[PDB]
């Protein structure tokens with residue numbers, strides 16, 4: 001049979017949330033910036049031999065509308081927390097997402113993956129070690145991705161599914 | 171009106187005439203921001219709104235447009251440079267028809283703007299209100315129907331013509 005997972009992609013404006021999602025869904029890289037209000041996608045995949053339906057909620061980077069954002073977090077089962085490796089502010093924003101997720105879901109252990117996107121670019125401002133150290137302090141995986149080259153895209157989403165499954169085993 | 175200029179947009183839906191919306195621009199209270207929108211409506215600086223798209227329309231909230239530089243919802247520019255500061259927050263988002271500047275945070279006004287179709291008071295103090303629909307609110311309501319929850323429009327809504335009414 002199969003299972004279904006509600007994945008929520010969060011992160012600051014322009015980090016590549018939609019580009020990552022569109023690579024997963026449509027297998028092409030959106031070169032242009034089309035700022036998101038809200039979009040949802042579905043994809044059937046096999047992860048670790050187990051078929052599942054991924055429900056992906058692609059959120060806007062904006063952080064107003066707390067009622068809507070709280071609802072995203074209540075319904076979501078796992079969170080892709082995306083920053084861009086050439087945007088230090090977006091990396092500094094990460095802890096706010098983790099704190100808001102822990103608060104809304106009333107738990108210190110919520111399935112999450114830290115994603116450092118745009119790794120194809122030569123303009124890095126956030127060191128891999130810096131992001132690895134942050135992910136270690138949360139006890140979550142860290143994955144470097146490029147939506148442009150597709151590097152790490154499947155890995156980021158599949159790892160998030162593994163994190164949900166590990167959480168459900170507890 | 172004895173003081174505030176009036177400008178118009180002739181709105182098109184996939185190139186076809188929908189109708190005219192006119193705006194009173196509150197130069198009496200928001201002169202720099204009103205003057206930017208006026209000049210962009212006449213095109214007198216060599217650029218402006220003519221031909222641009224209402225790219226984001228969300229029923230119950232607003233019709234947003236004004237990106238004539240990138241044509242994708244991320245751009246626009248003012249008559250003062252790429253961006254200009256928030257002039258004042260004297261006026262508030264009190265109901266349908268309010269004309270207010272879109273932005274990307276403090277002091278990032280360019281040319282993008284929105285027409286409220288409802289009271290949007292949570293934007294007070296963050297977006298500079300500078301005008302209101304004078305005639306053609308029915309046309310704004312017609313435009314609103316082409317929008318959707320995520321802002322995407324079912325037909326292309328453009329400013330086919332624009333200018334100043336004396």
Ligand SMILES: CCn1c(-c2cccnc2[C@H](C)OC)c2c3cc(ccc31)-c1cc(O)cc(c1)C[C@H](NC(=O)[C@H](C1CCCC1)N(C)C(C)=O)C(=O)N1CCC[C@H](N1)C(=O)OCC(C)(C)C2
Nearest residue numbers: 035037038060062065068228231243244272273274282284
């Ligand atoms: C949580 C879902 N959600 C909601 C929301 C809230 C409550 C209930 N239901 C919803 C929607 C219907 O659930 C799907 C909104 C909303 C808005 C954004 C994202 C998700 C949003 C949003 C996304 C953006 O990318 C940008 C903005 C909002 C602000 C926007 N700035 C830009 O566009 C700028 C450009 C202008 C200057 C040059 C750059 N830009 C691209 C960036 C990145 O800054 C702006 O100034 N305005 C005007 C005033 C109006 C604003 N847009 C808006 O669209 O509000 C929609 C509503 C009111 C519904 C608010």
Ligand SMILES: Nc1nc2c(ncn2[C@@H]2O[C@H](COP(=O)(O)OP(=O)(O)NP(=O)(O)O)[C@@H](O)[C@H]2O)c(=O)[nH]1
Nearest residue numbers: 013014015016017018019031036061118146147148
């Ligand atoms: N070089 C490069 N560009 C990328 C990458 N991911 C996204 N981009 C580019 O960065 C811009 C923003 O991408 P986008 O996915 O729209 O970002 P977002 O996080 O969804 N923004 P929003 O919060 O407004 O919805 C686009 O121009 C896109 O092509 C990447 O891995 N590499």
Ligand SMILES: [Cl-]
Nearest residue numbers: 062064065293
């Ligand atoms: Cl907003």
Ligand SMILES: [Mg+2]
Nearest residue numbers: 017018035036
């Ligand atoms: Mg997006």
